[PDB]
Amino acid sequence: ASLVGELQAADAEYQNLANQEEARFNEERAQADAARQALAQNEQVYNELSQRAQRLQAEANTRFYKSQYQELASKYEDALKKLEAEMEQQKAVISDFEKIQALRAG
Structure with missing residues (x-):
């Protein structure tokens, strides 16, 4: 018979969980943006x-050497080949993020 405590506990958790989830999302986005730029560099070098x-x-065939x-x-x-593989990972970080962003909405 102390229902008032448990609720304020659930609220604390809810406030935090909401902040952590949002922080994670931003981090994951930060990483996807970096990959977007890194990919552009490799795009040209390749x-x-x-x-x-x-x-x-x-x-x-006709060189002296x-x-x-x-x-x-x-x-x-x-x-x-090694670069081609690295680019595939980058494209994946970007896409994978977009898919998550997309579905985390509609």
């Missing part, structure tokens, strides 16, 4: 490196 890599592998060309071309090919 371009030249991808451009460079096709060039190397194109000249390579064919081997060194084919070797460096291969080194870019691997770095390109």
Whole structure:
């Protein structure tokens, strides 16, 4: 027979939970925005490196240093794959956030 206490307890919790949930949302958004920018950088770098890599592998055959060309071309090919994977994670952080933002509303 102390119903008045339990309610003020539930309110305390409710005030906090509401603040923590909102803080988390903002953090998750902060991260998605960062990813949006980071992705734009990799978007451009991937371009030249991808451009460079096709060039190397194109000249390579008639270069005096064919081997060194084919070797460096291969080194870019691997770095390109690694970057391509990193970009996929970024796109995922962004999208995943948008989906959550979307459904957390309508």
